[PDB]
Design a protein around this ligand. Structure first.
Ligand code: GCP
Ligand code: MG
Ligand code: NA
Length: 414
């Protein structure tokens, strides 16, 4: 039988609005990632979506069909069990331009990515570009480009767009990135995509001796309403471990922590707690490593974790030394153009006292520029940010025409 293990790798799913990211994840995993009522109602991804699957291979059968997502080789005429390869998981990002920040958050959790390009829409759409560039900037470079919805266009049209994609990636880090055509909705050529995932998105090496750091994207109260107080379960915090590993019963802290109000005056203080449980999907474990989205059960009052209250926090061991900063210095570079805009726009240089949006790990924070130089800016933040290492990538956004747009990136210097 196949072992029950945590996912060992995170694959982002990005691309322009309605190009079929969520349906693609469903075609691969059998799971629809949209869990929130507002998402199902409006017909869009809003929060980061998540889904897991095992990946195996039928060793006597021919590829790519030999690749499977369940322990069966019957589809190639074998009664033998397929060889288990690994468990993988998907970080399903929203495509809407207004939700770019959320994509950025998700990108901090990705080991690799699939860029979904609809074959029946003109390439390259604004968020195709913005997500692509974001991936490059952040360093998520194990990329597969998927042409989705090919079953509604002729082979000729698909090939025309394929040529466009090669032209686009030529001269960039993605020049030799593979392009794989599928229909997510009708489940066509999915096997080729699985094969591509095995070939192009290897599980990266993990140095488990590093200090444990988890980036937080979820937090919730798992109690049913009208639950008896003496049966109230502790708050749960969800996210991905980007380095090291966590274990049940470890003393941990959430940084920057909780918002404290003292007569209108606002500060943040670390939340200290203890790991009471560890879960990936429907399975419980004793330890949690990079790869997958983990649910950390704690002894926290559920009111503290309710409704993603802790989104953008990090979790570390209680004794870790981590700067929590209300001002940061960033060694930066700007893009030439606002790639996410419908109409072409040049990026203006950073101006003093300008308000910018900074993406750091899973966090998104507004700040005011207090110093501008050619290679460096300094920023006074509205809320503090936890900086767990030197030279963490940040992505810089500017409000253009009422919309926050990515305009550059940098390294947080401590
Ligand atoms: N014809 C066809 N339609 C598809 C395919 N994949 C998705 N769609 C359609 O596109 C629409 C949006 O699909 P969805 O998977 O939600 O796209 P999405 O990119 O996740 C939307 P968002 O950007 O808000 O997260 C749906 O009507 C869906 O049926 C496909 O392979 N072929
Ligand atoms: Mg979606
Ligand atoms: Na990564």
């Amino acid at each position: 039988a196949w072992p029950k293990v945590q996912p060992e790798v995170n694959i982002g799913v990005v691309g322009h609005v309605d190009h079929g990211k969520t349906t693609l994840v469903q075609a691969i995993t059998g799971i629809w990632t949209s869990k929130h009522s507002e998402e199902l109602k409006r017909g869009m991804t809003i929060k980061l979506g998540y889904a897991e699957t095992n990946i195996g291979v039928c060793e006597s059968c021919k590829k790519p069909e030999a690749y499977v997502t369940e322990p069966s080789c019957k589809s190639c005429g074998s009664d033998d069990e397929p060889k288990f390869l690994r468990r993988i998981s998907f970080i399903d990002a929203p495509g809407h331009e207004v939700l770019m920040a959320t994509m950025l958050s998700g990108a901090a959790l990705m080991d690799g990515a699939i860029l979904v390009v609809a074959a029946n829409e003109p390439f390259p759409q604004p968020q195709t570009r913005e997500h692509f560039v974001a991936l490059g900037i952040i360093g998520v470079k194990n990329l597969i480009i998927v042409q989705n919805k090919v079953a509604v266009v002729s082979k000729e049209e698909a090939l025309s767009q394929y040529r466009q994609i090669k032209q686009f990636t030529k001269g960039t880090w993605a020049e030799n990135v593979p392009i794989i055509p599928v229909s997510a909705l009708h489940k066509i050529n999915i096997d080729s995509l699985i094969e591509g995932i095995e070939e192009y998105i290897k599980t990266p090496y993990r140095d488990l001796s590093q200090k444990p750091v988890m980036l937080v994207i979820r937090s919730f109260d798992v109690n049913k309403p009208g639950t008896q107080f003496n049966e109230l379960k502790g708050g749960v915090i969800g996210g991905s471990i980007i380095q090291g590993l966590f274990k049940v019963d470890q003393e941990i802290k959430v940084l920057p922590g909780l918002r404290v109000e003292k007569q209108g005056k606002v500060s943040y203080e670390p939340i200290f707690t203890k790991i009471s449980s560890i879960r990936f999907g429907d399975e419980e474990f004793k330890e949690a490593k990079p790869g997958g989205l983990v649910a950390i059960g704690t002894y926290l009052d559920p009111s503290l974790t309710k409704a993603d209250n802790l989104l953008g926090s990090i979790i570390t061991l209680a004794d870790a030394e981590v700067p929590v900063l209300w001002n940061i210095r960033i060694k930066y570079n700007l893009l030439e153009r606002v790639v996410g805009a419908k109409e072409m726009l040049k990026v203006d240089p950073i101006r003093a006292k300008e308000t910018l949006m900074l993406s750091v790990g899973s966090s998104t924070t507004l700040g005011i520029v207090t110093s501008v130089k050619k290679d460096e800016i300094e920023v006074e933040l509205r809320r503090p940010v936890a900086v767990w290492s030197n030279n963490i990538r940040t992505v810089i956004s500017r409000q253009i025409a009422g919309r926050w747009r990515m305009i550059g990136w940098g390294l947080v210097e401590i």
